[PDB]
Amino acid sequence: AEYQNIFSQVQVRGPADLGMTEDVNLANRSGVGPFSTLLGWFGNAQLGPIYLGSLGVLSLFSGLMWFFTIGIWFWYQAGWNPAVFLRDLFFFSLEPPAPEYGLSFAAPLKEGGLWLIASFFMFVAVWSWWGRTYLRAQALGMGKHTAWAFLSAIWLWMVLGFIRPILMGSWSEAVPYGIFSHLDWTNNFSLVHGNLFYNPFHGLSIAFLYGSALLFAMHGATILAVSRFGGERELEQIADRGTAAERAALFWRWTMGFNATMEGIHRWAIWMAVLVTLTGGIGILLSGTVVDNWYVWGQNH
Amino acid sequence: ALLSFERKYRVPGGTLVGGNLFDFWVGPFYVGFFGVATFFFAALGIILIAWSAVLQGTWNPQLISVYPPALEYGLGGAPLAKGGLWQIITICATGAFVSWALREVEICRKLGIGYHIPFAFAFAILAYLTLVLFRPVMMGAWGYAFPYGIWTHLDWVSNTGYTYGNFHYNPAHMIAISFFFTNALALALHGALVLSAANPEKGKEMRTPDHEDTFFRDLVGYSIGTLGIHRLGLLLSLSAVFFSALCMIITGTIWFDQWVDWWQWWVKLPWWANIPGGING
Amino acid sequence: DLASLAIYSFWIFLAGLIYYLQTENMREGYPLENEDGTPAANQGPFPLPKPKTFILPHGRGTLTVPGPESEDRPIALARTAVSEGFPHAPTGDPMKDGVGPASWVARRDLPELDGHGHNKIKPMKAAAGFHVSAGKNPIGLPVRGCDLEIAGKVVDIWVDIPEQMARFLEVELKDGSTRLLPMQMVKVQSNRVHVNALSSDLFAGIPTIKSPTEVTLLEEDKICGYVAGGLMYAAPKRKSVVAAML
Ligand code: BCL
Ligand code: BCL
Ligand code: BCL
Ligand SMILES: CC[C@H]1c2cc3[nH]c4c(c3C)C(=O)[C@H](C(=O)OC)c4c3nc(cc4[nH]c(cc(n2)[C@@H]1C)c(C(C)=O)c4C)[C@@H](C)[C@@H]3CCC(=O)OC/C=C(\C)CCC[C@H](C)CCC[C@H](C)CCCC(C)C
Ligand SMILES: CCCCCCCCCCCC[N+](C)(C)[O-]
Ligand SMILES: CCCCCCCCCCCC[N+](C)(C)[O-]
Ligand SMILES: CCCCCCCCCCCC[N+](C)(C)[O-]
Ligand SMILES: CCCCCCCCCCCC[N+](C)(C)[O-]
Ligand SMILES: [Fe+2]
């Protein structure tokens, strides 16, 4: 019938691409990994190379340590028994210091201290990776757009596990490391703050989360609809507009009265998605510090 | 009013219904048979919402709320002010949405492009229709659907959620959330990558795809490519809505209790089921 | 109350951001024109952004947007009604004249370059080390048009080297010359490549490339424009779903 260009018909492969050099310290780049024919049906088949400077090494070490602190506690909670570990994996939880400890680091290892060490490791890992998104762009002379977008995601994480606890005077206010328990905490947080559906910023965050899936459904579909004119080669279409960019713009103008440009739709994209965690972060930061009950706040409004 | 390059595309043809009769534009908007069908269904649905507002005794945006037929009616008709009006507005809504998708198909036909956007929109229409048609019919009553009101549909989400405990424990809801979160992540990243290359450090030459691939290769050791990221985006957002629709159409039809209890099937598995320790022993 | 100040400030910001984003998306296509090229009186509530300039690599110049419209080629379409808002009909052959779904834009008549300043798309013959790694290899298959008549045979795959993907199939015609068919417009089957957009008789009219070893963005746009235009204009010769699944 027609070809929808969702999965490739024929794969083609050539010599591994080592990348652009620009000001990247090449000594810090690994070799090429394998090529996967599976991935190649949907995207590029090549795996690697990866850059691993000192910052990449620190991020991986602290992140593996974050995983290890959580892992060892889970194994302890499982009585070191493999079968118990596997049946209750989603049920285990590394919990914060109890309220009485406030913000001190004097909590016993099994009762808060292990959580503190895990949080330290995740803090270092995430901020190291943030530095790395900045510096890899810098070495290639690119704008710092990824690092700034990553800062919005980091805002929510920072508010949830560090900034709002510190402002509230207690580590018990932060999230546990566990699959079901972080879900329980999320539910409990709404209950305690008088139903988060009345928080104006949670409503906005939701609007931007739904908005992100509306807009990537729209953008992805538009590009594959004009991939028959090389539409996915967006940077040359920005540099020298072709019929793919014109027909893409005119579908939406004829459908809903206004449209984007091949460069401009990526600004709508980064902002739609960034605003999810930006509004979300403000929403959580105000909860408990300024507003104790959002239903009540909603009444005086 | 046309864009600088638009005239050459405004040709005849592409209409699915009624030949050239509705083949024209009002300002930027294309009309077509499905353009007038969306205007009819949208207008009648809005007039019926205004009439439900009149009957409810309010004109306030925040307070207007059209409710489904209360459970006694099952899947039968209802008096207009007690659920009948919802039923008609639902017909109008389905009609306006399907017409919007079919209008998009006529615009695709005139522009010679693929039908990917109407196809993707159909998933959101099917999600709406799961909550309003498929799950109510499978459950035996229209009252299980949501109210058409800004704050009241949220009340519906909350009550429906809590009938099954913390709705987070629904496994298909978990998958749906994962796709929404990953979709927003990917969107941020794609926007950021095309923009970092098109707008390099001040004074440098515009970067190329190769630089996008090398940035992501240096950062995470893979680059899905420019075709792949758009393929991925469409798939993440569509899978998010599919699993949303799935998590609801199973709730109330084949699962009736607290969703947290589902997870016990894995715990009660014979070989580890009775070992003391952990969280469940 | 702090939360009250916060949400008020947010809506102010958001109004500002949407103004920025929409003006930003007016760098192409604006000013708006009436159906005869004159400036339209109603330009809407957003002004044109101040210019930005892209420095294009390897001696390709600069692009400053917003700017004067680059399209100056004749558009072969007659007005159909005196009133604004109606179709403009093809005066000649729409496929050949490059209008409607067969439109093309006068893009730069140089090949797209990779990051290293080399041609991005190359015939696989010349792309050293490139080979079909999975899927039915189309080279050698007959190419069948929508009228279910054979139009040629695939003599090569043109490859995007940096993305490692098939972009075009080079098809040899009955007179021995070749044409490029966009990969995303063909169906590679087990014994045939089928092109739904074009009947066999239309394959000779596909825009040609000048050099046997490279394609320019201008050529690509004319090839892709022509081929997609076939979905509307070749529809008389397109045999039914019935006729083809027999
Ligand atoms: C998906 C699960 C639930 C649900 C759960 C929630 C939750 C939870 C929240 C919302 C919120 C919203 N919901 Mg809801 N909502 C549902 C189904 C719908 C339907 C529908 C036809 O199916 C519609 C139109 C809406 C519409 C809305 C918006 C008014 C609001 C912001 C959403 C958004 O930005 O989307 C993204 C889309 C865009 C960015 C495109 C722009 C669309 C605009 C904003 C839609 C306006 C709708 C309009 C007022 C409806 C009347 C139409 C006619 C004029 C009569 N919901 C289903 C039943 N909805 C949020 C809120 O703040 O509510 C008070 C919120 O927190
Ligand atoms: C009963 C529970 C409550 C509720 C309680 C909460 C609470 C509590 C919170 C939210 C939040 C959110 N809620 Mg809610 N919410 C409810 C009902 C809803 C409904 C609905 C009914 O349909 C919807 C659509 C939403 C939607 C949302 C989102 C808009 C928002 C989360 C954004 C996000 O992307 O975070 C995901 C993004 C992150 C978590 C950022 C992560 C970034 C870091 C840096 C990643 C580190 C990774 C790490 C190192 C490990 C991996 C590395 C490997 C190499 C892979 N809620 C009900 C009423 N909701 C959050 C919010 O922002 O508030 C507004 C929030 O805190
Ligand atoms: C307290 C309540 C429970 C809970 C109860 C429910 C319930 C109940 C439902 C969900 C649903 C959802 N929940 Mg939940 N959920 C909870 C907590 C969460 C959290 C969180 C972080 O805590 C998250 C991330 C989520 C996430 C999700 C999403 C996966 C899903 C909503 C998207 C969707 O269906 O889109 C689908 C998209 C649509 C329905 C939109 C259709 C739009 C139509 C086609 C067009 C509209 C056009 C418009 C009228 C035109 C406007 C014109 C204007 C002029 C612009 N939930 C809590 C624990 N959740 C919903 C679901 O799965 O739905 C199927 C659902 O019903
Ligand atoms: C399938 C995946 C995602 C997606 C995709 C998507 N949406 C799409 C498309 C796509 C690909 C379009 O092409 C189409 C579009 O043109 O976008 C600009 C659209 C669209 N997605 C929209 C909204 C939307 N999409 C949503 C979600 C999603 N859309 C998913 C996240 C949501 C929510 C809440 O998450 C909303 C609000 C519309 C803006 C637009 C379709 C426009 C359209 O069909 O409108 C014609 C209708 C009218 C002019 C008015 C009719 C009014 C009725 C008669 C009354 C209706 C009342 C209603 C039933 C209740 C309202 C009250 C609520 C508070 C409950
Ligand atoms: C996410 C990667 C999973 C990809 C699996 C999909 C494989 C598609 C295989 C069909 C091969 C293409 N075809 C039919 C034209 O030969
Ligand atoms: C408080 C958290 C800070 C998050 C703010 C993040 C803004 C990201 C903006 C993306 C657009 C800006 N820019 C320069 C990168 O293009
Ligand atoms: C084997 C370890 C798997 C457990 C990983 C735990 C994921 C839940 C993470 C929630 C953490 C939230 N946070 C960062 C803000 O504290
Ligand atoms: C940053 C994303 C903001 C999400 C809200 C989307 C608003 C779309 C507004 C359309 C305004 C453009 N306009 C006036 C020309 O139609
Ligand atoms: Fe894009």
UniProtKB/Swiss-Prot annotation, chain A:
CDD domains tied to this protein: Photo-RC_M
InterPro entries, per database record: Photo_II_D1/D2_sf, Photo_RC_L/M, Photo_RC_L/M_CS, Photo_RC_M
Chain positions recorded as (7R,8Z)-bacteriochlorophyll b binding sites: H182, H202
Binding site for a ubiquinone: W252
Keyword Lipid biosynthesis: no
Transmembrane spans: 53-79, 110-139, 142-167, 197-225, 259-285
PROSITE patterns: REACTION_CENTER (PS00244)
Membrane-topology annotation of the record: Multi-pass membrane protein
Annotated Gene Ontology cellular component terms: plasma membrane light-harvesting complex; plasma membrane-derived chromatophore membrane
GO molecular function annotation: bacteriochlorophyll binding; electron transporter, transferring electrons within the cyclic electron transport pathway of photosynthesis activity; metal ion binding
Residues at which Fe cation binds: H219, E234, H266
Entries under Pfam families matching the protein: Photo_RC (PF00124)
GO biological process, one term: photosynthetic electron transport in photosystem II
Keywords annotated in UniProt: Bacteriochlorophyll, Chlorophyll, Chromophore, Electron transport, Iron, Magnesium, Membrane, Metal-binding, Photosynthesis, Reaction center, Transmembrane, Transmembrane helix, Transport
Record bears the keyword Membrane: yes
Locations listed in the record: Cellular chromatophore membrane
Annotated signal peptide: none
Oligomer and partners: Reaction center is composed of four bacteriochlorophylls, two bacteriopheophytins, two ubiquinones, one iron, and three highly hydrophobic polypeptide chains (designated L, M, and H).
Function: The reaction center is a membrane-bound complex that mediates the initial photochemical event in the electron transfer process of photosynthesis.
Family note: Belongs to the reaction center PufL/M/PsbA/D family.
Protein name, entry field: Reaction center protein M chain
Organism for this UniProt entry: Cereibacter sphaeroides
Gene: pufM
Curated annotation (Swiss-Prot), chain B:
UniProt protein name: Reaction center protein L chain
UniProt topology in membrane: Multi-pass membrane protein
Residues annotated for a ubiquinone binding in this entry: F216
Subcellular location per the Swiss-Prot or TrEMBL entry: Cellular chromatophore membrane
Residues that hold (7R,8Z)-bacteriochlorophyll b according to the record: H153, H173
Major location category of this protein: membrane
Cytoplasmic side: 1-31, 112-115, 199-224
Gene: pufL
Description of how the protein assembles with itself and partners: Reaction center is composed of four bacteriochlorophylls, two bacteriopheophytins, two ubiquinones, one iron, and three highly hydrophobic polypeptide chains (designated L, M, and H).
Any one Gene Ontology molecular-function term assigned to this protein's record: metal ion binding
Function in brief: The reaction center is a membrane-bound complex that mediates the initial photochemical event in the electron transfer process of photosynthesis.
GO cellular component: plasma membrane light-harvesting complex; plasma membrane-derived chromatophore membrane
Family that this chain belongs to: Belongs to the reaction center PufL/M/PsbA/D family.
Residues engaged in binding Fe cation: H190, H230
Periplasmic side: 56-82, 139-170, 251-281
Swiss-Prot record, chain C:
UniProt topology in membrane: Single-pass membrane protein
Molecular-function annotations in GO: bacteriochlorophyll binding; electron transporter, transferring electrons within the cyclic electron transport pathway of photosynthesis activity
Required cofactor names: a bacteriochlorophyll; a bacteriopheophytin; Fe cation; Mg(2+)
Top-level taxon of origin: Bacteria
Cross-referenced Pfam families: PRC, PRCH
Record keywords: Bacteriochlorophyll, Chlorophyll, Chromophore, Electron transport, Membrane, Photosynthesis, Reaction center, Transmembrane, Transmembrane helix, Transport
Cytoplasmic side: 22-246
SUPFAM superfamilies: Photosystem II reaction centre subunit H, transmembrane region, PRC-barrel domain
Subcellular location: Cellular chromatophore membrane
Keyword presence, rRNA-binding: no
Entry annotated with the keyword Transmembrane: yes
InterPro entries: Bac_photo_RC_H_C, Photo_RC_H, Photo_RC_H_N, Photo_RC_H_N_sf, PRC-brl_dom, PRC_barrel-like_sf
Cofactor remark: Binds 4 bacteriochlorophylls per trimer.
Bilayer-spanning residue ranges: 2-21
Physiological role: The reaction center is a membrane-bound complex that mediates the initial photochemical event in the electron transfer process of photosynthesis.
Family recorded in the similarity comment: Belongs to the reaction center PuhA family.
Assembly description: Heterotrimer composed of subunits L, M, and H.
Protein name per the record: Reaction center protein H chain
Originating organism: Cereibacter sphaeroides
Recorded name of the encoding gene: puhA
